[PDB]
Design an enzyme around this catalytic site. Structure first.
Site, short mmCIF file in Angstrom:
data_model
loop_
_atom_site.label_atom_id
_atom_site.label_comp_id
_atom_site.label_asym_id
_atom_site.label_seq_id
_atom_site.Cartn_x
_atom_site.Cartn_y
_atom_site.Cartn_z
N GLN A 146 0.81 -1.21 0.00
CA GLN A 146 0.00 0.00 0.00
C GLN A 146 0.85 1.27 0.00
O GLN A 146 0.34 2.35 0.29
CB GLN A 146 -0.94 0.00 1.20
CG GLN A 146 -1.73 -1.28 1.38
CD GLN A 146 -2.95 -1.34 0.50
OE1 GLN A 146 -3.28 -0.38 -0.20
NE2 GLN A 146 -3.65 -2.47 0.52
N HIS A 147 2.14 1.15 -0.31
CA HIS A 147 3.01 2.32 -0.31
C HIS A 147 2.65 3.31 -1.41
O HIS A 147 3.05 4.47 -1.34
CB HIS A 147 4.47 1.90 -0.45
CG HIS A 147 4.83 1.36 -1.80
ND1 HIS A 147 4.41 0.12 -2.24
CD2 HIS A 147 5.56 1.90 -2.80
CE1 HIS A 147 4.87 -0.08 -3.46
NE2 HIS A 147 5.57 0.98 -3.83
N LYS A 175 7.10 -5.81 -10.26
CA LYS A 175 6.90 -5.61 -11.69
C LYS A 175 6.63 -4.15 -12.01
O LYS A 175 7.22 -3.58 -12.93
CB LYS A 175 5.73 -6.49 -12.15
CG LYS A 175 5.42 -6.43 -13.63
CD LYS A 175 6.43 -7.22 -14.43
CE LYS A 175 6.00 -7.31 -15.88
NZ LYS A 175 4.76 -8.13 -16.02
N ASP A 193 8.99 2.04 -13.14
CA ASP A 193 8.62 3.37 -12.66
C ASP A 193 7.14 3.67 -12.89
O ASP A 193 6.77 4.78 -13.27
CB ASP A 193 9.49 4.45 -13.29
CG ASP A 193 10.95 4.32 -12.91
OD1 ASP A 193 11.23 3.85 -11.78
OD2 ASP A 193 11.82 4.68 -13.73
N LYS A 230 -4.05 -9.01 -7.16
CA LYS A 230 -4.41 -10.13 -8.01
C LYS A 230 -5.73 -10.69 -7.51
O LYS A 230 -5.98 -10.74 -6.30
CB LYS A 230 -3.34 -11.22 -8.01
CG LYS A 230 -3.52 -12.26 -9.08
CD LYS A 230 -3.25 -11.69 -10.46
CE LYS A 230 -3.28 -12.78 -11.52
NZ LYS A 230 -3.06 -12.23 -12.88
N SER A 242 -1.43 -0.15 -19.60
CA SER A 242 -2.54 -0.01 -18.66
C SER A 242 -2.44 1.29 -17.88
O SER A 242 -3.45 1.97 -17.65
CB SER A 242 -2.56 -1.21 -17.70
OG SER A 242 -1.66 -1.01 -16.63
N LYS A 301 -5.27 8.29 -19.42
CA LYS A 301 -6.21 8.82 -20.41
C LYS A 301 -7.61 8.93 -19.83
O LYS A 301 -8.30 9.94 -20.05
CB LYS A 301 -6.22 7.93 -21.65
CG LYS A 301 -7.51 8.03 -22.45
CD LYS A 301 -7.47 7.20 -23.71
CE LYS A 301 -8.82 7.21 -24.41
NZ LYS A 301 -8.73 6.68 -25.79
N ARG A 329 14.72 3.37 -20.59
CA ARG A 329 15.19 3.90 -19.31
C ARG A 329 15.34 2.80 -18.27
O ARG A 329 16.32 2.77 -17.51
CB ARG A 329 14.25 4.99 -18.81
CG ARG A 329 14.94 6.07 -17.99
CD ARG A 329 13.98 7.17 -17.60
NE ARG A 329 12.86 6.67 -16.81
CZ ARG A 329 11.93 7.44 -16.26
NH1 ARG A 329 11.94 8.75 -16.41
NH2 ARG A 329 10.95 6.87 -15.56
#
EC number: 1.4.1.3
Lengths: 570, 123, 486
Positions: free
Chosen positions: C75-76, C105, C110, C117, C372, C378, C448
């Site tokens: 929850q960071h 992942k 970043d 899940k 995603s 968006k 990057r």
């Protein structure tokens, strides 16, 4: 690259063709008139109808290439028997064609026919036909029924004393059976009396070379000592006195070898007993079953008071093994307190004295006053104290340091000769390889190993020890090393062998009629021992199913002693 | 065959079939037709059923009889993988091999292909 | 071993490696920093797991109960991202392990997300469309009640067993019952079709990510001098195992930018053609009828394709395809994990021993979560990307070209015409859309992340063991984020 397939029904076709040729009345190439009798038949069919006729009249000699063939001793009975056998395709004896066939076969000079008649008479021997059986035995005396006839005469010597069959019975076979000690007998009290009655008349109980042909010292003297004590003096009493001291010399059993203490028979094999099994089967091996070559399987039997030793040493010194302690930390350390020695020459086992230092998995040679061990080590770690293991005397004394620092090394007497290839500083692979022979107890000069390979699987190739390839983590993967190095001083040339899939680290060395067999091994990829036993013969260039042991153990000692009666009977 | 030897003749026929070169294709069918052996014909039929895929690419399919090929395809014993391959083989049997590498005329042998057995999207 | 222990040992290795340098690299008091290493043990367990049980009316009037799970690892960072799987093999351990994997992942590339899940113990083939509709509606409502669906809390995503069709139901069932008053109600779920607010280029996201990850490492002189490549255009051959979405897309892009595909495999038999395989023809053949059996100009290769001679291997199939036995018998030079753990740790040491580069799966297939994240942005922006800037940029470029043309004509007296752009530039100008921006962002992110992973591996003196480098980088980022608050 042509091959030839033969049907199993071709005999019937050949017989039918011969019968058709005989009944046709044509294709006759040999015409013979004997005793004024004229018949028409095929020469090949006539030769094939009988057995000795083909070998007699069709032997390619001068008489076989003549218009007239001279036959002597051939009666009408033989011709009638041949015709009956040809017509009925049957070869057997009955109650009305036994004496006549034997009588007519004496003048026919046919040994096979006489032997067959004697065998048939033996198979149809009754009390009312004793004379005919004796006559048939005297006429032929076949080499296959001689043992049976001798056994029957010996078992019924009371009746054979007045019977004429005793004179016609074999004498060498009976004498050999009497001197034999491995014959199957349910007791040694009534059997001894029966043998004494058969050998000598009851009047005796109440020069001749055959008398000295019996090797009393060679046979079991334990039961015959009482009989020999009351018998006449003989030079065979020294063996009994010599063997008396062997009872209190269990520790010095290999050292107490004698000229008359040779190993009886050559029944050497692998027995799935002893050792410590950690991988790949978590089952303790306890069934001491001996494989029977006649039966082909290691049938279970009453293994009462069987010698159960764990992680015992393996050595081959005149069929006597001497070892001190035991260590198998490479495949899983397992403390054990039972020590057993395999001495098939003495047919006995005893608990040897445990030595102070547990040094094993090395080469033990029966030389000098005691067995010598090359340096020494603890169960799994090297120690700064150097001592020689003397389990026979249980004397812990300091010994001089070895030329090469070897701890828990691997060594064995290959083909009765001590040899060492490369080396290993315990469980950790080293960079310097030195070959020190345990037999010579010195660092003998040898060819340096260009490739740091050790702990490989060794088999019997070209009647010498050979190590080819290997399986370790020093090559960076589980591949096969192309370079093969073998030192064969006696052969003088390198012995090419297939690479060993499983490494042999401090395993038991066993020789079974010059056929090397490997059980277990080292599998670095699996992280445990080898769950299967495979033999890779270089000449065969294929994998074949060998004798699968009951337990897939590594470095399991093999014990040779007296087998159980049930196990022996299979 | 004149000596009434079944085993030797069968072994020789099997060896010839297993060692039959492409350049001797005409030496197999003609030999089987002339000899009329009880085992050579079966071996030739099995070889055809097992190498029809290879023969379709070559000219051997064109040389083979159309009626015999159609009869063999009609039986539910030929080894096939996909309906498209069966359709291609039928076209090669009913049309020139060079032309394929004519659907105007619907041949009778085309009906031997099991339409319901084909893929739904392909059908 | 299983998946849970396999992904659990990696964190232990990473933390053990990190701690030594992290004690002093972050110190700013009585040398109590060692006792501060409880932060690492906080990261391990999942914060929340929930199990559901809800009824369904069924089409025949019967009643059934369905079990579902959802886990939240970290929850960071407030929004959580995860998938929803419809299978009968789901379990709490599997979903919590997958959420734990998803946190790192997202941290590697970043993406400011957490990790989650979900799994529903159901077989989709046993129900019609109406039953699946009811299942999805009830599951979304039950999740919304307890607070596992919120756009600012938790954001689901499609898994292998679900499609955009289910997410369309989730979006409008959340936007009309609980989040009716929320202006960002449609941003709760990503992966929905275009008409309800999807993003373009979502289908080819994972293949593009895999290709970019491979390219970023196949153009580094330092790493490929260890084995010897002369890389980038040397017509290096590659084989693809598994012809799913990711394999097909990555193979097409690799062939398009100068690579030869020699062999293609699947669950059933494979094919082989040293002359190369045309991606379009193979795709059309597969779309025509089932699998790719009997493909023209493709020999039916026999044996293990994983051991076939090649230069790049793409194991996009089920788990633990490469094991200890298979490891020494392969001939490939680079392993590109396109699935979730194609290789076992026991076989990783084998590859490390023979200096075989293995690109970690934690980094290679992050395109799915990157796009995603872009779709979520968006939906938050309420406008498609580039709508307000395409014409402005076109006019600016035309003005630049006209200015340079006039200035060049001024000096040289005849009239030069540099105003005309190239064919590629003209096609790019004419057909500008959202997919270009999405692809550009994905490529930038992958490049990057690759650079950061390489520099981390160099800094901690690691060789070709890129898996540990990626795990260390993710753990360090998570620790840095989580430390500066508590």
């Amino acid at each position: 690259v042509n091959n030839t397939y033969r049907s199993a029904q071709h005999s019937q076709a050949l017989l039918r063709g011969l019968l058709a040729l005989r009944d046709s009345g044509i294709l006759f190439d040999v015409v013979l008139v004997v005793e004024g009798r004229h018949i028409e038949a095929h020469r090949i069919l006539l030769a094939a109808s009988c057995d000795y006729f083909r070998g007699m009249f069709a032997g390619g000699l001068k008489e076989m290439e003549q218009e007239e063939v001279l036959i002597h001793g051939v009666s009408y009975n033989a011709m009638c028997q041949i015709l009956h056998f040809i017509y009925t395709s049957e070869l057997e004896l009955s109650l009305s064609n036994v004496q006549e066939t034997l009588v007519a076969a004496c003048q026919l000079q046919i040994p096979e026919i006489i032997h067959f008649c004697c065998d048939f008479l033996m198979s149809w021997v009754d009390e009312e036909n004793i004379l005919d059986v004796y006559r048939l035995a005297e006429l032929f005396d076949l080499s296959r029924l001689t043992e049976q006839l001798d056994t029957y005469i010996l078992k019924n010597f009371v009746a054979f004393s007045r019977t004429d069959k005793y004179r016609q019975l074999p004498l060498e076979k009976v004498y050999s059976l009497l001197s034999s000690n491995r014959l199957e007998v349910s007791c040694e009290t009534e059997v001894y009396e029966g043998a004494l009655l058969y050998h000598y008349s009851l009047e005796q109980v109440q020069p001749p070379k055959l008398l000295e042909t019996v090797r009393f010292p060679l046979m079991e003297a334990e039961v015959l000592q009482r009989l020999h004590d009351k018998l006449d003096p003989s030079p065979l009493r020294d063996t009994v006195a010599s063997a008396l001291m062997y009872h209190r010399n269990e520790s010095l059993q290999p050292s107490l070898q004698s000229p008359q203490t040779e190993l009886r028979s050559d029944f050497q094999c692998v027995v799935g007993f002893g050792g410590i099994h950690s991988t790949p089967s978590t089952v303790l091996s306890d069934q001491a079953k001996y494989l029977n070559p006649l039966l082909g399987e290691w049938k279970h039997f009453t293994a009462s008071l069987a010698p159960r030793m764990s992680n015992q040493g393996i050595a081959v010194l005149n069929n006597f093994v001497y070892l001190i302690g035991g260590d198998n930390n490479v495949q899983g350390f397992r403390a054990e307190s039972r020590c057993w020695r395999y001495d098939p020459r003495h047919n006995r086992w005893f608990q040897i004295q445990s030595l102070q230092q547990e040094h094993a998995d090395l080469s033990v040679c029966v030389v000098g006053r005691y067995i010598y061990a090359v340096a020494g080590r603890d169960y799994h770690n090297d120690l700064n104290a150097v001592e020689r293991y003397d389990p026979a005397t249980n004397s812990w004394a300091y010994v001089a340091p070895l030329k090469r620092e070897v701890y828990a090394h691997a060594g064995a007497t290959l083909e009765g000769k001590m040899y060492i290839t490369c080396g290993r500083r315990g469980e950790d692979y080293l960079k310097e390889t030195h070959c020190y022979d345990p037999g010579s107890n010195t660092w003998h000069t040898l060819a340096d190993g260009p490739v740091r390979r050790a702990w490989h699987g060794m088999a019997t190739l070209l009647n010498k020890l050979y190590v080819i390839g290997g399986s370790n983590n020093d090559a960076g993967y589980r591949r096969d090393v192309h370079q093969v190095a073998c030192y064969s001083c006696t052969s003088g040339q390198w012995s090419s062998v297939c690479p060993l899939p499983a490494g042999h680290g401090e395993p038991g060395i066993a020789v079974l009629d010059n056929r090397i067999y490997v059980l277990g091994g080292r599998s670095h990829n699996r992280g445990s021992r080898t769950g299967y036993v495979h033999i890779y013969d270089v000449e065969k260039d294929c994998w074949e199913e060998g004798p699968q042991l009951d337990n897939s153990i590594s470095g399991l000692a093999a014990c040779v002693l007296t087998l159980p009666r049930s196990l022996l009977l299979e | 065959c004149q000596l009434q030897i079944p085993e030797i003749i069968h072994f020789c026929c099997d060896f010839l079939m297993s060692w039959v070169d492409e350049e001797n294709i005409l030496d197999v069918y003609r030999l089987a037709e002339l000899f009329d052996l009880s085992r050579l014909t079966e071996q030739l039929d099995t070889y055809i059923l097992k190498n029809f895929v290879a023969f379709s690419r070559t000219d051997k399919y064109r040389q083979l009889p159309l009626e015999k090929v159609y009869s063999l395809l009609s039986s539910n014993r030929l080894e096939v993988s996909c309906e498209t391959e069966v359709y291609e083989g039928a076209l090669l049997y009913h049309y020139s091999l060079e032309q394929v590498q004519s659907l105007h005329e619907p041949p009778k042998l085309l009906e031997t292909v099991r339409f319901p057995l084909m893929e739904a999207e392909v059908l | 071993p299983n998946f849970f222990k396999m992904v659990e040992g990696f964190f232990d290795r990473g933390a053990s490696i990190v701690e030594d340098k992290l004690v002093e690299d972050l110190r700013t008091e009585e040398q109590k920093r060692n006792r501060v290493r409880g932060i690492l043990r906080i990261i391990k367990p999942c914060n929340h797991v929930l199990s559901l049980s809800f009824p369904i009316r069924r089409d025949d009037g019967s009643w059934e109960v369905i079990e579902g799970y959802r886990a939240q690892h970290s929850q960071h960072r407030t929004p959580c991202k995860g998938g929803i799987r419809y299978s009968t093999d789901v379990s709490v351990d599997e979903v919590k392990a997958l959420a734990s994997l998803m946190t790192y992942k997202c941290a590697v590339v970043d993406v400011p997300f957490g990790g989650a899940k979900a799994g529903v113990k159901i077989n989709p083939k046993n129900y019609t469309d109406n039953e699946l509709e009811k299942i999805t509606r009830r599951f979304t409502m039950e999740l919304a009640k307890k607070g596992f669906i919120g756009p600012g809390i938790d954001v689901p995503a499609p898994d292998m067993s679900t499609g955009e069709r289910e997410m369309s139901w989730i979006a409008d069932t959340y936007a009309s019952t609980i989040g009716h008053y929320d202006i960002n109600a449609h941003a709760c779920v990503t992966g929905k079709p275009i008409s309800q607010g999807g993003i373009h280029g979502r289908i080819s996201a994972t293949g593009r990510g895999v290709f970019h990850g491979i390219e970023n490492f196949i153009n580094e002189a330092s790493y490929m001098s260890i084995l010897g490549m002369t890389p980038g255009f040397g017509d290096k051959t590659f084989v693809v195992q598994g012809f799913g979405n990711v394999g097909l897309h990555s193979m097409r892009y690799l062939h398009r930018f100068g690579a030869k595909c020699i062999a293609v495999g699947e669950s059933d038999g494979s094919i082989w053609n040293p002359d190369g395989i045309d991606p379009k023809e193979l795709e059309d053949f597969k779309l025509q009828h089932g699998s790719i059996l009997g493909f023209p100009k493709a020999k039916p290769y026999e044996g293990s394709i994983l051991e076939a001679d090649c230069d790049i291997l793409i194991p996009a199939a089920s788990e633990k395809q490469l094991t200890k036995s298979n490891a020494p018998r392969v001939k490939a030079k680079i392993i590109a994990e396109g699935a979730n753990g194609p290789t076992t740790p026991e076989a990783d040491k084998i590859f490390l021993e023979r200096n075989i580069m293995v690109i970690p799966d934690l980094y290679l297939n992050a395109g799915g979560v990157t796009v995603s994240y872009f779709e979520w942005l968006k939906n938050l922006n309420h406008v498609s990307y580039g709508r307000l800037t395409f014409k402005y940029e076109r006019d600016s470029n035309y003005h630049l070209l006209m200015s340079v043309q006039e200035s060049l004509e001024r000096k040289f007296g005849g009239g030069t015409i540099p105003i005309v752009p190239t064919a590629e530039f003209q096609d790019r100008i004419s057909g500008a859309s959202e997919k270009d921006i999405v692809h550009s962002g994905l490529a930038y992110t992958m490049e990057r992340s690759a650079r950061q992973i390489m520099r981390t591996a160099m800094k901690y003196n690691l060789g070709l063991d890129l898996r540990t480098a990626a795990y260390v980088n993710a753990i360090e980022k998570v620790f840095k984020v989580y430390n500066e608050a508590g």
